[PDB]
Enzyme design. Sequence first.
Site, PDB file in Angstrom:
ATOM      1  N   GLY A  92     -42.899 -17.604 -22.009  1.00 48.08           N
ATOM      2  CA  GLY A  92     -42.821 -16.268 -22.567  1.00 48.08           C
ATOM      3  C   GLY A  92     -43.885 -15.327 -22.012  1.00 48.08           C
ATOM      4  N   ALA A 107     -35.377 -13.459 -26.442  1.00 47.62           N
ATOM      5  CA  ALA A 107     -35.097 -13.999 -27.756  1.00 47.62           C
ATOM      6  C   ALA A 107     -35.269 -12.958 -28.841  1.00 47.62           C
ATOM      7  CB  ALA A 107     -35.977 -15.226 -28.033  1.00 47.62           C
ATOM      8  N   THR A 135     -39.416 -16.392 -27.632  1.00 47.37           N
ATOM      9  CA  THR A 135     -39.496 -17.426 -26.602  1.00 47.37           C
ATOM     10  C   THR A 135     -40.723 -18.321 -26.819  1.00 47.37           C
ATOM     11  OG1 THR A 135     -38.349 -15.920 -25.072  1.00 47.37           O
ATOM     12  CG2 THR A 135     -39.508 -17.804 -24.077  1.00 47.37           C
ATOM     13  N   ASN A 152     -55.617 -13.466 -31.491  1.00 46.08           N
ATOM     14  CA  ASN A 152     -55.725 -12.218 -30.735  1.00 46.08           C
ATOM     15  C   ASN A 152     -56.723 -11.261 -31.374  1.00 46.08           C
ATOM     16  OD1 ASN A 152     -54.396 -12.387 -28.382  1.00 46.08           O
ATOM     17  ND2 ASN A 152     -52.491 -11.405 -29.067  1.00 46.08           N
ATOM     18  N   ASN A 197     -56.831 -11.213 -21.734  1.00 45.95           N
ATOM     19  CA  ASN A 197     -56.413 -12.349 -20.926  1.00 45.95           C
ATOM     20  C   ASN A 197     -57.520 -12.796 -20.004  1.00 45.95           C
ATOM     21  OD1 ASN A 197     -54.001 -12.210 -22.235  1.00 45.95           O
ATOM     22  ND2 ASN A 197     -52.778 -11.484 -20.462  1.00 45.95           N
ATOM     23  N   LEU A 236     -62.183 -34.158 -20.564  1.00 49.54           N
ATOM     24  CA  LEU A 236     -61.581 -33.599 -21.767  1.00 49.54           C
ATOM     25  C   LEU A 236     -61.019 -34.674 -22.717  1.00 49.54           C
ATOM     26  CD1 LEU A 236     -60.900 -31.120 -23.422  1.00 49.54           C
ATOM     27  CD2 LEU A 236     -58.760 -30.970 -22.073  1.00 49.54           C
ATOM     28  N   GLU A 268     -62.118 -37.563 -23.319  1.00 49.73           N
ATOM     29  CA  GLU A 268     -63.210 -38.142 -24.080  1.00 49.73           C
ATOM     30  C   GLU A 268     -63.620 -37.242 -25.250  1.00 49.73           C
ATOM     31  OE1 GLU A 268     -65.926 -40.664 -21.777  1.00 49.73           O
ATOM     32  OE2 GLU A 268     -67.551 -39.540 -22.826  1.00 49.73           O
TER      33      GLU A 268
HETATM   34  N1  LIG Z   1     -53.431 -12.520 -25.712  1.00 53.14           N
HETATM   35  C1  LIG Z   1     -52.228 -12.078 -25.335  1.00 53.14           C
HETATM   36  N2  LIG Z   1     -51.229 -11.922 -26.253  1.00 53.14           N
HETATM   37  C2  LIG Z   1     -50.013 -11.498 -25.865  1.00 53.14           C
HETATM   38  C3  LIG Z   1     -49.734 -11.173 -24.559  1.00 53.14           C
HETATM   39  N3  LIG Z   1     -48.421 -10.777 -24.520  1.00 53.14           N
HETATM   40  C4  LIG Z   1     -47.898 -10.833 -25.761  1.00 53.14           C
HETATM   41  N4  LIG Z   1     -48.875 -11.278 -26.588  1.00 53.14           N
HETATM   42  C5  LIG Z   1     -48.751 -11.547 -28.011  1.00 53.14           C
HETATM   43  O1  LIG Z   1     -47.618 -12.380 -28.116  1.00 53.14           O
HETATM   44  C6  LIG Z   1     -46.873 -12.015 -29.289  1.00 53.14           C
HETATM   45  C7  LIG Z   1     -45.458 -11.592 -28.910  1.00 53.14           C
HETATM   46  O2  LIG Z   1     -44.886 -12.620 -28.142  1.00 53.14           O
HETATM   47  P1  LIG Z   1     -44.398 -12.557 -26.597  1.00 53.14           P
HETATM   48  O3  LIG Z   1     -45.081 -13.635 -25.779  1.00 53.14           O
HETATM   49  O4  LIG Z   1     -44.545 -11.218 -25.938  1.00 53.14           O
HETATM   50  O5  LIG Z   1     -42.821 -12.812 -26.787  1.00 53.14           O
HETATM   51  P2  LIG Z   1     -41.950 -13.807 -25.907  1.00 53.14           P
HETATM   52  O6  LIG Z   1     -42.457 -15.237 -25.939  1.00 53.14           O
HETATM   53  O7  LIG Z   1     -41.883 -13.246 -24.528  1.00 53.14           O
HETATM   54  O8  LIG Z   1     -40.547 -13.866 -26.715  1.00 53.14           O
HETATM   55  P3  LIG Z   1     -39.365 -12.781 -26.704  1.00 53.14           P
HETATM   56  O9  LIG Z   1     -39.774 -11.544 -25.948  1.00 53.14           O
HETATM   57  O10 LIG Z   1     -38.972 -12.472 -28.138  1.00 53.14           O
HETATM   58  O11 LIG Z   1     -38.200 -13.452 -25.981  1.00 53.14           O
HETATM   59  C8  LIG Z   1     -47.629 -10.885 -29.949  1.00 53.14           C
HETATM   60  O12 LIG Z   1     -48.485 -11.521 -30.859  1.00 53.14           O
HETATM   61  C9  LIG Z   1     -48.365 -10.297 -28.768  1.00 53.14           C
HETATM   62  O13 LIG Z   1     -49.508  -9.557 -29.078  1.00 53.14           O
HETATM   63  C10 LIG Z   1     -50.757 -11.314 -23.604  1.00 53.14           C
HETATM   64  O14 LIG Z   1     -50.607 -11.058 -22.401  1.00 53.14           O
HETATM   65  N5  LIG Z   1     -51.989 -11.762 -24.017  1.00 53.14           N
HETATM   66 MG   LIG Z   2     -40.542 -11.670 -24.029  1.00 56.99          MG
END
Ligand SMILES: Nc1nc2c(ncn2[C@@H]2O[C@H](COP(=O)(O)OP(=O)(O)OP(=O)(O)O)[C@@H](O)[C@H]2O)c(=O)[nH]1
Ligand SMILES: [Mg+2]
EC number: 3.6.5.-
Lengths: 440, 69, 430
Positions: free
Chosen positions: A10, A99, A145, A206, A228, A252, A254
């Site tokens: 995702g 998703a 996802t 986050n 990130n 790790l 251990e």
């Molecule tokens: N730390 C961090 N959080 C992220 C990032 N991208 C999305 N998020 C967090 O991830 C969550 C949303 O999920 P996503 O990963 O974007 O969604 P996905 O897995 O792509 O699923 P769908 O888009 O619904 O198919 C929220 O809490 C966002 O703030 C990122 O690059 N870094």
């Molecule tokens: Mg997505």
Amino acid sequence: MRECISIHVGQAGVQIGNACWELYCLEHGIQPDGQMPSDKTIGGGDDSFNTFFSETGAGKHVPRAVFVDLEPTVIDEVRTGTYRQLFHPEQLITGKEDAANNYARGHYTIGKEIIDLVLDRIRKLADQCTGLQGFLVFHSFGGGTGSGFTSLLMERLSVDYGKKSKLEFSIYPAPQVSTAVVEPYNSILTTHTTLEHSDCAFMVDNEAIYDICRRNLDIERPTYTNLNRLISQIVSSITASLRFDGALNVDLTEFQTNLVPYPRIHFPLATYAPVISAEKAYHEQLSVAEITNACFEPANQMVKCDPRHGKYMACCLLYRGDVVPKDVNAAIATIKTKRSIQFVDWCPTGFKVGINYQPPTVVPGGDLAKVQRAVCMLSNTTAIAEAWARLDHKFDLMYAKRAFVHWYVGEGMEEGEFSEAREDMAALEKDYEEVGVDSV
Amino acid sequence: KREHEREVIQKAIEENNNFIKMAKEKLAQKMESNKENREAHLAAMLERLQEKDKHAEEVRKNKELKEEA
Amino acid sequence: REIVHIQAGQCGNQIGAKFWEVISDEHGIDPTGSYHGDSDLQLERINVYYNEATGNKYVPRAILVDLEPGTMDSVRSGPFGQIFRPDNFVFGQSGAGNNWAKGHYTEGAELVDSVLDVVRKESESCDCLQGFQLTHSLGGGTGSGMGTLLISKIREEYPDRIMNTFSVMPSPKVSDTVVEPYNATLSVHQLVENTDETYCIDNEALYDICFRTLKLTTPTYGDLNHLVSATMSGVTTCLRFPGQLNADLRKLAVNMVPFPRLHFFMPGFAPLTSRGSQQYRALTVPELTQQMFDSKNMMAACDPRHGRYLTVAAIFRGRMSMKEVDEQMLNVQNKNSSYFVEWIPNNVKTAVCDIPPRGLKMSATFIGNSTAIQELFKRISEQFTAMFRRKAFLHWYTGEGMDEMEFTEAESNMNDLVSEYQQYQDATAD
Ligand SMILES: Nc1nc2c(ncn2[C@@H]2O[C@H](COP(=O)(O)OP(=O)(O)OP(=O)(O)O)[C@@H](O)[C@H]2O)c(=O)[nH]1
Ligand SMILES: [Mg+2]
Ligand SMILES: C/C(=C\c1csc(C)n1)[C@@H]1C[C@@H]2O[C@]2(C)CCC[C@H](C)[C@H](O)[C@@H](C)C(=O)C(C)(C)[C@@H](O)CC(=O)N1
Ligand SMILES: Nc1nc2c(ncn2[C@@H]2O[C@H](COP(=O)(O)OP(=O)(O)O)[C@@H](O)[C@H]2O)c(=O)[nH]1
Ligand SMILES: [Ca+2]
Ligand SMILES: [Mg+2]
């Protein structure tokens, strides 16, 4: 030399993977085209960095990694970005339709269409390994996802690799950057269904990262790129024992022996220091004792909770850079005479220490100062259960009214999976309670 | 003692296999339960829409029997 | 990715045409279909609404429908009338006569298959169809009746896609036709069952804005429609530009619709200033924010302080401080906590797009799912039952084959919707 395969699921998993693999390349002297001049063994080798990189006869060092997303637009930027030559096109896997922030679509409706292909590509990576140690899975709790597809994948990996180890890096939701009202639902569903397929899971809140970027790096409104880069530094500290060797290095696995006292109690709190801007690091040497002491300040944790108000079951310190044991031992003796470190009564209280000598790297144009020494503390504290309680409460508020539940039922799910998952979370919260009660 | 050592390793093998087996089976039952639920939801949506169509043809022939006066 | 756009009837086609003019200017498409823009962000998501034809020409994925030829020939003569695909005009001629039953059951039922032929051609060409948006009014006969018939037929053929509508609600202040409460109630009866999300464009609120705040003694349909088009541009920015939040119709629905029947949205826009005040009033983030949440900037004639918000999306556009937007949105929620339901945590989402609409340095678009929308349905129900009590004008509808019972059923469904909005407004977390 036992290989590790990384799976990035995702948007959050993929984008954090971008930051991690860029950082690893810089740490090992690997160029964006995969050439590594310092590696004199062409097309193969048994070096520490080969746990994460395989080698082609042409001298390319290729991440042992799969990127998976149910829509194409995030992975397309990998296919077309700076590091596009690093990855074979078959490691980058995309569907057409995501998703929609719905666990049910990630695990069933859309995910079932792509899972066999994904496992096939993972199989292709596993077959190139002579001693596969396990997988590292990166994903968000909140996305459809990251939650649903990851749970599907974890179940399927348990079937195809037995009890080969699976570790997670899990992005826990924060309202400052969250994208969906239903993230508490997706979070509880994925935690329930993954719990018995995961050996150890590093939760990254986050909000903790966001506040660290605001306070310690003076970024007024952090983006995912800010979050990130900091996350990748912490991931790098955790994997550095796998990718480098050295005398005082401690693997790790251990640490894992010490970090997981019962299969369900497998959620270490990570705390990283120093996080400091170039402008403040200038002419400010931060010693072993200062960064160690910073490990015990809750503002430096990757999950918001208060270890002062729970009990420790393990404390591990992963140093990197210019650090020798005498300085570590002195700093630890200081901390123990002054801090709120109470262990459960069934656990020894010694801190387990690893030191990797290769010093931390920073990405060009990042916000972290390049420092001479860093530390990541991994602890097992009952306080991490706070993160579950917060999420469970949000779940309860909506589930009492069945708000949004029709989106899950429409995709084939039943209310019984909701209540089953929520009961599993209530039993997990009680487990964290029970481990902290004194022995009779 | 040798017989005990054999029993320990065969117990480990058996527990790993039963874990793989139960994960496989519960996944397959979840996927089938879910495909059935989703198809039933869609089929009910479609049946409602088709009853709308039957009521529309009813309304049109009602008009044509009252334009027979 | 792709959205198929349908505009039906007179209102439907006029507000649809203005929508395509506004977003084509935003994306740098000229009336011939050619791109002449300055920012690559104009083309990143252009295929959501446009097909790429030979010659690097962009063609709206738009279908123009009416039971009269009038408005659509006006469309073809309009400024962007040349942009539309000619095969995508599907007009009849008998007309509807402001009669829902004619649009739904008889005359429109005769044109519907021909419309469905164009929808399939457009849908078959999509890599990944999101769904459909329909522009129409609920007060006439083509837009209301044939538009809801077409929704039902499309849903029969694409049951797993999202169905979105921009529905213009009737007001005595803007139109004289006395059967509008009938048409609107029968329309709503359909919408409740067959759309996933509906933007309530209320002509009552549009009039009141034009008259009271903008001080136009004689507001044109042209002035109502400038409001409508600025709003429609705002609420589709998240589908049309690169972005994180509500970036497609299903994700928007998943964020906005906690219960499948409560899917009627109150839109809002800021800024709205009179010529007089436009010199005084500064365009700051705190004041965009406070307007966006004010009863007077709502495109639906309801007071949010008379109910509670289930969910909210706010879209800021233009160059501004994101820290300041974050602080002001937190401040609105803090100071107005009682008006957001406590049992849906974190139900206000905020997006910021860099590209402002034409003629503004910054704007704000509001989408609210508020239990105060019942005020709108109540108003229609009143006007409905004042007529239906006396069986007034029923013969236009029985004349087409309908029974009284369908009227009773539509009235009861709408009253049920109102009751459900009330139930969740009264719900407590404990
Ligand atoms: N730390 C961090 N959080 C992220 C990032 N991208 C999305 N998020 C967090 O991830 C969550 C949303 O999920 P996503 O990963 O974007 O969604 P996905 O897995 O792509 O699923 P769908 O888009 O619904 O198919 C929220 O809490 C966002 O703030 C990122 O690059 N870094
Ligand atoms: Mg997505
Ligand atoms: C300039 C402005 C706000 C602003 C900028 S700086 C500040 C303090 N306020 C908005 C633009 C905004 O596009 C709208 C959505 C369209 C407005 C067009 C309306 C529908 C009538 O048709 C029109 C004849 C007006 O009534 C005027 C007074 C000219 C208009 O100007 C009002 C306004 O509120 N316009
Ligand atoms: N806002 C707006 N409302 C309109 C417009 N044209 C018609 N209406 C409203 O639509 C209703 C009449 O429906 P109309 O679209 O003209 O009938 P149709 O052609 O049978 O669909 C009345 O309540 C009108 O006030 C328009 O351009 N803008
Ligand atoms: Ca080598
Ligand atoms: Mg008309």
